[PDB]
Design a protein around this ligand. Sequence first.
Ligand SMILES: Nc1ncnc2c1ncn2[C@@H]1O[C@H](COP(=O)(O)OP(=O)(O)O)[C@@H](O)[C@H]1O
Length: 243
Amino acid sequence: HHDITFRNIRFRYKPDSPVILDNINLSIKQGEVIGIVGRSGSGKSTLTKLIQRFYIPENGQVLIDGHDLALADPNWLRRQVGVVLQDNVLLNRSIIDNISLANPGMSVEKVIYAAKLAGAHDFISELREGYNTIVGEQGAGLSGGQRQRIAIARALVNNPKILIFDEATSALDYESEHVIMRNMHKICKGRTVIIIAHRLSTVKNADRIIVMEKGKIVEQGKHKELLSEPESLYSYLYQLQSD
Ligand SMILES: Nc1ncnc2c1ncn2[C@@H]1O[C@H](COP(=O)(O)OP(=O)(O)O)[C@@H](O)[C@H]1O
């Protein structure tokens, strides 16, 4: 079963604007963990915007869990997709409010479960005010890596069938990265996962990597297979990021 399908997708942001995605064809199986890589502005984030129907393509179809998004319930779609946002933790609000910022009338139990998957529960639990701690500066002083785990918990809380990781915009402390990587298999378990990767190393072990260049998928496959294509863009990007 394919959880996400793009067929012949063409997209530009505005009527006059340049084509950003051109004839994208992609089929992602349920439970697959996919990495998306490529230079800045290749169209990686735009692809995920279309999955959420934030924009509508001028040609082609996006199908989510078999449903053409043209016809699909927008509320259902909102519930099927969880996005791990960058720099989106509200400082003026509690940790629990930040995690449940979609279904406010939801379980403390559901919040805790998501924070445990995210590897946040342990550090939250050792806070004077626990989950009621206000995130903000002089109000808690949570690190960027702590805030990122809260962001993961927020994405997981409603148990989405599809999980998307937006491209990393900063660097995380060793402890935060370590905890997340140790927990990735639990976070991704039972879900279709798309990771937009800043460093190719992040997604070395994804089921498949998709390589974008100038709005096109140019290459796709497992890491070892992409490195086997003699003049691949993947190999060049791999070389560039190497020590
Ligand atoms: N909201 C927007 N309006 C107009 N152009 C945009 C918008 N968002 C992104 N773009 C443009 O789309 C192209 C691809 O962007 P993006 O999908 O974010 O690439 P990536 O995620 O690979 O860096 C870039 O030229 C970028 O400036």
